[PDB]
C-alpha cells in the first residue's frame, strides 16, 4: 500500500468545478455507476463525483467502473484506485489522500469474496461491500475510477470519484 494521490490530481480542477451527483439508491443497495459518465468528451477532462450518504444500517454499496476494452479505445489508460478495493479505501489525511484498510475504519464490515461468481475487485468491473449494523463515529472514504489519461482524437476522458460519507447509526 502507501500509495498517494489527490482528488484533483492532474485534471487541474477545483471542487466547485466538479459535476456532483448522488448515488442511484435502490432500496438496501446504493449504486454509483460510471459506465457512461467517463467516456471521452470534447470538453474533457471533466470530474464526476458520486456521493454515497449512508445514514441507516446494512446498506450494500456497489460501484461500477468500466474496464480496459469493454468498449474500444475509450478506456485504454483507465486506472482505479485503490487497486485492492473494496478492502482498501482512501481517507483524507492532511489534505493528501492515503490508503487505509476499510476494516480498520469500520468494524463488522462484510466484503463478499465474489460478486456474481467473480472476484470482488475493480478488475472485474464492480466492487461491493455491506456496511455493518452499527457504526460508532462518522467515517468518510473515497474510491477513484479515473479515465482522464485516455485520449481519443481531441477528446479526453473524465475522472470518477466515489465519496462514501457514513454517519453514526445504531446504539
Amino acid at each position: 500500500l502507501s500509495y498517494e494521490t489527490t482528488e484533483s490530481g492532474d485534471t487541474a480542477v477545483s471542487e466547485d468545478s466538479y459535476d456532483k451527483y448522488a448515488s442511484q439508491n435502490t432500496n438496501k443497495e446504493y449504486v454509483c455507476d460510471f459506465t457512461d459518465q467517463l467516456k471521452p468528451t470534447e470538453s474533457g477532462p471533466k470530474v464526476k463525483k458520486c456521493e454515497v450518504k449512508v445514514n441507516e444500517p446494512l446498506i450494500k454499496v456497489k460501484i461500477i467502473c468500466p474496464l480496459k476494452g469493454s468498449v474500444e479505445k475509450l478506456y485504454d489508460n483507465i486506472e482505479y484506485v485503490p487497486k485492492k478495493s473494496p478492502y482498501v479505501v482512501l481517507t483524507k489525511e492532511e489534505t493528501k489522500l492515503k490508503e487505509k484498510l476499510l476494516s480498520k475504519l469500520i468494524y463488522g464490515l462484510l466484503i463478499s469474496p465474489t460478486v456474481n461468481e467473480k472476484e470482488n475487485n475493480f478488475k472485474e468491473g464492480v466492487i461491493e461491500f455491506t456496511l455493518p449494523p452499527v457504526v460508532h463515529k462518522a467515517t468518510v472514504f473515497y474510491f477513484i475510477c479515473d479515465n482522464s489519461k485516455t485520449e481519443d482524437d481531441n477528446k479526453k476522458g473524465n475522472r470518477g470519484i466515489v465519496e462514501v460519507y457514513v454517519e453514526p447509526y445504531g446504539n
Partner: single-chain antibody
Amino acid sequence: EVQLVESGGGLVKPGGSLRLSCAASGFNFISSYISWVRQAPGKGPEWVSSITSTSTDIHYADSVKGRFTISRDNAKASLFLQMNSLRVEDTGVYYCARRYCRGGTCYLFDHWGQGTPVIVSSGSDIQMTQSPSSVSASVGDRVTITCRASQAISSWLAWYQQKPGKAPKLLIYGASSLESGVPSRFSGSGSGTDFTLTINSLQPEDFATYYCQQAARFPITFGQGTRLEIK
C-alpha cells in the same frame, strides 16, 4: 451451448462486394460484444470491426475503413459485415468472435465461429513478433515459444491455441494465468515487451499453432503464430 455460425463466404473479383452474417445462439446476444476477426493465408488473426450491443459505438480497422460496414440485429441474434471495394489482401477466413473480460481487460475473445472463407482474386499499432516460426518435437519434450511486443504492454498478453481446421482458443491471459481447464504443463511468463509460453511435457493433443495477442490497447493485435508439430 454457445454457438456462432458464419455465412456469406464466397469468391469475388477485386472491386467486388460481399456480405457476411453471423448467427448467435446459447447466450444473451443483447449484452454481448461481438467483433469480426479475419485470418489471411500465412498470417495470424487480424481484428477488423466491432459494434456495441446498442449500436451506438462502432469501430473499424484502418485497412477496411470506408469499405466495410458492420451492423447487428439483436432480435435475430445476428451480426452483419458488408464488404465493398474488396481487394486481394481481404482474402482469408472471416470469424465472428465474442469478447469477454478476463483479468483486467476485455481485449480477449471467448468463443469463435468456424469462419466463412472469402476469396478475392481474378488470377502507430502494436506489432507482435513471434519465435520460432515452427517447431517439430517428440512427445514428452519441452518447447518454449517467444513473443515480443513493439511497445510496453505490462502483462496484457494472451496466448491462443488453434488446432488445424478449428478456430483459436484462449489458453493464457495476463501473460501467466491459465484459463479454466487448461492443463498444468502450459506455462506463461514475461512482462513489458518480451513474453514466453512453455509446455513442459508435450502430449499429442498439443499439436497446433499458437498465437500471442496483446490485450493492452486498441487495436487488438496478434502475432504470426508458431506451428507446433508432434512427431
